[PDB]
Write a structure and sequence with these properties.
Structural class of chain A: mainly beta
Order of helices and strands of chain A: EEEEHEEEEEE
Oligomer: part of a larger assembly
Number of helices of chain A: 1
Strand content of chain A: 15-25%
Distance between the termini of chain A: 45 Å
Family (chain D): Belongs to the ryanodine receptor (TC 1.A.3.1) family. RYR1 subfamily.
Number of strands of chain A: 10
Protein name (chain D): Ryanodine receptor 1
Largest interface: B-F, 18 and 18 residues
Organism (chain D): Oryctolagus cuniculus (Rabbit)
Binding site for Ca(2+) (chain D): 43
Subcellular location (chain D): Sarcoplasmic reticulum membrane
């Protein structure tokens, strides 16, 4: 049957736009430790050369209502989870890798003479700018419905009061949240996994013999160039 | 001339209160920040001068 | 702004029975001068022109001053003298030689109150002015 | 729909300790309507 | 991957044809064609512990 | 000319008795970001005049 987007499940944002009259496969990402500003990772050429999806993997930390979030804000002083997501709830994305939370930033770029607020990864979830709110793209759904997989979403910022946006310009496709309510698809990369079993994305060490062998490339400063 | 003067009349008039909500509530700060961005300073002074 | 905006009025195009077209610029001080009355923060800019510019309008009544706006315009000078740190001696010379001395009682009694507020604001504590030292007693004698 | 609405009202008054008279009067009106829908819901399934 | 110019070797990401680079596991070294594939959108069962 | 009359009616919503009502002002400023993106690239920010 049709699955639903449960909390505490890994996920990846997704969008598409036309540059040569073709729906390019794109996804948001960010390096984290270094340039904190987010950047766009193309994936349309995945058949002929694969992308780097490790940084792209986001995680749903929790979700709640707007008024409950405001009460959490007022109650700044500090269970089972898996609450199903509904439209109008205040989502909270998180970078699975860097452990830095997605948020808006009080910056500007490209000199639009207008708010851009280039999105990035805040170092801590404290403060109200970190939180985001979902909304429905297609009219066939409405507020309060149980959000499913595949349907298009319209993420909105809480504090900035600005909508996520794929900004096409002269340069590379910027993802500043400035102008337009872009149809942001929401691909579940993974979900609750079984204990003690292998899945994609998990990094592992290959053993041989009984225990005392490991596949590896030679260390650096070597004549083989580590190949 | 009349159109832009009326437009800034609306935009200037709808500031958050005078000082009541500005001294603490967040809605006033958000509205004032977006309000200052669209028509930044060092353009009013040229036009009035 | 007090360097620029205050200097846009070229004495507000003061009437000589030849100027009754730009009457709206007289009422432009309803909003423009109200800010000056409200706010009261070295002589980096020439404030002396602003003080005497207000002193022209409080006394002048040739153009139709629209008496509610006359009270409004009086409030600006009344607010300016309180905050002033004695940078109005040049402007202080003019009211001494008129109003009660040269009789303009119809348009000097409110100015008389504004001038009456001047000496009480400064006892002989942290100021001295030889030119103003003898001007005020001479005006007091004559008045 | 009524559940989401009344739940949001609880969050608005959660920080406040004492409840206003007007607030309690409003909430009682909503509660009475909620009672009637519960009884009407019961009669569709009372009797197997 | 296996680029075949030298043999089994670790190639750069920008030269991956998704057939030399692609790999798969197997239950045992017994020769089985494994012609009928399988597919499911969900998690599926856990096979490899 | 057409815009000035509509903006005049929008003016009369807000300055009721020398104040600024927050609710109507809030809805107005949210709506004013989108639909006044017209009037050319001057105030839109895409230009710069």
């Amino acid at each position: 049957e049709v699955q639903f987007l449960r909390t505490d499940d890994e996920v990846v944002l997704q969008c598409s736009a036309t540059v040569l009259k073709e729906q390019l496969k794109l996804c948001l990402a960010a390096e984290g430790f270094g340039n904190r500003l987010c950047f766009l990772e193309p994936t349309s050429n995945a058949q002929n050369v694969p992308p780097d999806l490790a940084i792209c993997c986001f995680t749903l930390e929790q979700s709640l209502s707007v008024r409950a979030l405001q009460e959490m804000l007022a109650n700044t002083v500090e269970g089972g989870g898996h609450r199903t997501l509904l439209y109008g709830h205040a989502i909270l994305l998180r970078h699975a890798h860097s452990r830095m939370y997605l948020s808006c930033l009080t910056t500007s770029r490209s000199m639009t003479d207008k708010l851009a607020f280039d999105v990035g990864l805040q170092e801590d979830a404290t403060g109200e700018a970190c939180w985001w709110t979902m909304h429905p793209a297609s009219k066939q759904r409405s507020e309060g419905e149980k959000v499913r997989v595949g349907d298009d979403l319209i993420l909105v910022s809480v504090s900035s009061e600005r909508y996520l946006h794929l900004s096409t310009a002269s340069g590379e496709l910027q993802v500043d949240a400035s102008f337009m309510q872009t149809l942001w698809n929401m691909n579940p990369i993974c979900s609750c996994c079984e204990e003690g079993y292998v899945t994609g994305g998990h990094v592992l060490r290959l053993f041989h013999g009984h225990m005392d062998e490991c596949l590896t490339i030679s260390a650096a400063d070597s004549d083989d160039q580590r190949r | 001339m009349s159109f832009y003067a009326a437009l800034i009349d609306l935009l200037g008039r709808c500031a958050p209160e005078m000082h009541l909500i500005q001294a603490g509530k967040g809605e006033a700060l958000r509205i004032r920040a977006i309000l200052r961005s669209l028509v930044p300073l060092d353009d009013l002074v040229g036009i009035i001068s | 702004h007090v360097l620029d905006v205050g200097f846009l009025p070229d004495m507000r195009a003061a009437a000589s029975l030849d100027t009754a077209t730009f009457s709206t610029t007289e009422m432009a001080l309803a909003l423009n001068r109200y800010l000056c009355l409200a706010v009261l923060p070295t002589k980096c800019a020439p404030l002396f022109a602003g003080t005497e510019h207000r002193a022209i309008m409080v006394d002048s009544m040739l153009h139709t001053v629209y008496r509610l706006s006359r009270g409004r315009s009086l409030t600006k000078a009344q607010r300016d003298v309180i905050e002033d740190c004695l940078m109005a001696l040049c402007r202080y010379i003019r009211p001494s030689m008129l109003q009660h001395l040269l009789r303009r009682l119809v348009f000097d009694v409110p100015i008389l109150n504004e001038f009456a507020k001047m000496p009480l604001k400064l006892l002989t504590n942290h100021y001295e002015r030889c030119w103003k030292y003898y001007c005020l007693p001479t005006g007091w004698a004559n008045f | 729909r009524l559940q989401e609405s009344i739940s949001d009202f609880y969050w608005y008054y959660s920080g406040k300790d004492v409840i206003e008279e007007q607030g309690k009067r409003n909430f009682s009106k909503a509660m009475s309507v909620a009672k009637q829908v519960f009884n009407s819901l019961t009669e569709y399934i009372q009797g197997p | 991957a296996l680029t075949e110019d030298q043999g089994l070797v670790v190639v750069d990401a920008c030269k991956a044809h998704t057939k030399a680079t692609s790999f798969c596991f197997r239950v045992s070294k017994e020769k089985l064609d494994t012609a009928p594939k399988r597919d499911v959108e969900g998690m599926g069962p856990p096979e490899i512990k | 000319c057409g815009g000035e009359r509509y903006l005049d009616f929008l003016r009369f919503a807000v300055f009721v008795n020398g104040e600024s009502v927050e609710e109507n002002a809030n809805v107005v400023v949210r709506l004013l970001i989108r639909k006044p993106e017209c009037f050319g690239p001057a105030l839109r920010g895409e230009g710069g005049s």
